[PDB]
Write a protein that binds this DNA or RNA. Sequence first.
RNA 1: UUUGUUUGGUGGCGAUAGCGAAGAGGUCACACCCGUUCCCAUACCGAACACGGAAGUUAAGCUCUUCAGCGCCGAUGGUAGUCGGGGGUUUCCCCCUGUGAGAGUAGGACGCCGCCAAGCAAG
RNA 2: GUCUUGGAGGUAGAGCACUGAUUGGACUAGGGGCCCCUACCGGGUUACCGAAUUCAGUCAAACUCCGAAUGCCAAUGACUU
Lengths: 183, 120, 178
Amino acid sequence: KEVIVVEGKDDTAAIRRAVDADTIETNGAAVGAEVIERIKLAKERRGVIIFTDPAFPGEKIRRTIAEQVPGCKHAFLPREAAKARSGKGIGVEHASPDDIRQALANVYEETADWEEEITFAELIEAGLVGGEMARRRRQRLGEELKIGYANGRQFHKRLKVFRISRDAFYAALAQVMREEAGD
Amino acid sequence: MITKTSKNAARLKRHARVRAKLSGTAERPRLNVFRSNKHIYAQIIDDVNGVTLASASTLDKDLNVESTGDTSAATKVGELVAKRAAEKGISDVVFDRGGYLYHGRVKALADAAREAGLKF
Amino acid sequence: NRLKEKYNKEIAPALMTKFNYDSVMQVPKIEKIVINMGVGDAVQNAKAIDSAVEELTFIAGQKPVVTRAKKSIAGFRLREGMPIGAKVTLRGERMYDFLDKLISVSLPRVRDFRGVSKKSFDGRGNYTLGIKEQLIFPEIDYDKVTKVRGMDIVIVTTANTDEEARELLTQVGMPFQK
RNA sequence: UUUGUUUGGUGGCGAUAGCGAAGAGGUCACACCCGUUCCCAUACCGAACACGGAAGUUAAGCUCUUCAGCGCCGAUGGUAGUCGGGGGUUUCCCCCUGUGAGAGUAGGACGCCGCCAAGCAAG
RNA sequence: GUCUUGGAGGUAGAGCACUGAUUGGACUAGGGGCCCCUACCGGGUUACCGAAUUCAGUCAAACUCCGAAUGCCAAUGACUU
Ligand SMILES: [Mg+2]
Ligand SMILES: [Mg+2]
Ligand SMILES: [Mg+2]
């Protein structure tokens, strides 16, 4: 129903081989004004769910279009196909259509601009700084909640502005850190 | 309280000092070299037209040796750029040192390119 | 060595939570320290005694490097490139271990456990110390005949307000006017 | 293969590129950053310089976006001065055909112009 | 010789950016003097000397962030001689 925005024709074919939804090309990092207007009208009439690779250009275009048109829904490559070693690589052309279906299942940005309960202090208490556990657990929890990875402050910001339960995510955090411990 | 300046700034100043006393023309194009915390780069450059004639770096698709920051990697990139310059028809070149010291990594690159056919 | 270990352990989370910094790299932790003898006969007219240099050696990790004069000080007469006092810089584990051996013995080697309150700084993070005293470590008891052996030890940090110097020298423990 | 675009390098133009302030950004790249076994190094110090490593981080540097606060550039007109020609009560002043500043002002402006590599995209 | 074009140079004039000279305000710890009491504190003043600093205002042959008219040196064209 919504529009799907992707890098090029490869991700176009990939997403079309998974779910029936109309595609808009971003053509790399080059995004135009009229393109932004097309995204605006798409979000206004049918909606749009960004789905790019968790790489440098993909994450960059994702951030730019997110800052461009608020309220636009988002999706992320799950932990399996988001990494280059799985399938063919990191590109959407490298994931499975079922994986695209899961990404569609984990669509977010129904919430955009809320004042929430995510404390940075308790967040560093949970060990999201230094010791390699910062970035390790950051990636782990991001692909756990299917939200992607980021730096400490940016990931904290997007979570603190993303309306989700706090303590259920903290229990999931305990679960994931136990996975790191071996549980 | 204290402040620490950009090492790259001092490197730039020393590079200017060096380049003050030499220049690469279309006959002796200067061979530049750039060191990073991870990689190394080299560009054959003429001055009178501001053009690059050849280049090589650890960031190539080839050179599956993955220990960039090596002295050995410097040798590989040096011989590669030497071959690239040779096939393009270049024999002798002046050679700056960016602003670094004529020592292990950069000097290793220089020697590799030197024996490989370049006249310097 | 373990001193700086436990210092990280405590201070990093503590000073991060008490002072909300966006990045951890902003935590002001001590970096370098220098002690200035600055005596050189104290009048440069003894012209022969340099016990200062070797006592500085074996109270520190390394040997000092002797300074010199540059201009014509009115309070003196023979001041033209002549050497006056020395100095010692150190920032590695020598720094920390000297700090520990200081706070362990010289802090009791005082005549009064009040040290000095934070009234001798430069606003954006530093600490001078007053050294007209004589005995630092009993390493020099009779070998030294109690001649004037003062110093100027200056510890400096990557801080920006005096309060940071205060909290830093407190959390490790220094005699102030408590 | 060309084209578009971002970054890193490396150049050319008088700072109109500068300072200052406010912000956004790093998994690529650049960086801070982590150690000293040999290369090498400190009049002391792996500070810097060297060599290996990639734990963390955009905090700083770096890149982008805003501001005309300081600096910078800068008219038109009008006066001062003056070449040539004249007249006067000559330590100086006046007139005539030409030239024509400095200062001040309108204003401009928080950069343009190349090459190479890498990343993505399109062909 | 003239017309056109390109150069080098710091005079006339201007200006205070440098070096000296200089007027009147703001402001001063440092107080000088008065003193309170100052044996000593601390305080009105300091008639500050109030140092700078700042705000305005005047000068320079050996001051210059600027800077002509003329004259000088060349060029390649033209018209005269
Ligand atoms: Mg003018
Ligand atoms: Mg005059
Ligand atoms: Mg004059």
